[PDB]
Amino acid sequence: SGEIISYYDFNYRVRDTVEIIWKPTEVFLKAFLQNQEHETPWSPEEERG
């Protein structure tokens, strides 16, 4: 309801009757997480001894 989750595009003007068949076989978008590590801003690189 007022959400507009996803827009799609037909190739060319589907005209009379249309069918969309999900290519992965009956699954909509699927997601995967990413881990974006902390950028460690430093190069003193002190060493013991």
């Binding site: 002190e46 060493e47 013991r48 001894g49």
Partner: protein, 192 residues
Amino acid sequence: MLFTFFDPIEYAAKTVNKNAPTIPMTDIFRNYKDYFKRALAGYRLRTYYIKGSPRPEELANAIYGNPQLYWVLLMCNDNYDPYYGWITSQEAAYQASIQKYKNVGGDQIVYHVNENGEKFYNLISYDDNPYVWYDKGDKARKYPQYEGALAAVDTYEAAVLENEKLRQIKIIAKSDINSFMNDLIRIMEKSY
């Protein structure tokens, strides 16, 4: 141009990131230092310049040579480090002292230098006590060393003492260098 003198080759770097791009690179892998060594045969008795000035890294444009050669001074001393190999401005060693010990210990005493120059290394006196020195451990004493007396060199003095002994170098006398370099090429063109 008495370095280089050959070609870029190509540096594949294929052992890392296969299908890495080939980058033309000045050729530093010839074992140059040998050519110099063998070519030098017969020009020896290169005298001892003693330096005498905290000459910056290049005195080549003053003393023997002087096409700003910046080496044949290197190959002299078989210098591993072109930076700290040559002697440095007196303050530099001091400056070099801190960064060495800055992490641990602060300023210290490296050895106590008996007269006649017998170093000791972690040997410690006790004032207001017997006058005989002890190691930095076995605080029960019982195991004295060097019943005599001497004077510690702390740290700064050592670095000075250590880099200042690094001023003597060979020369090739400003006479041979032209005749010498005229040979040093010949060996190079020889092997190919």
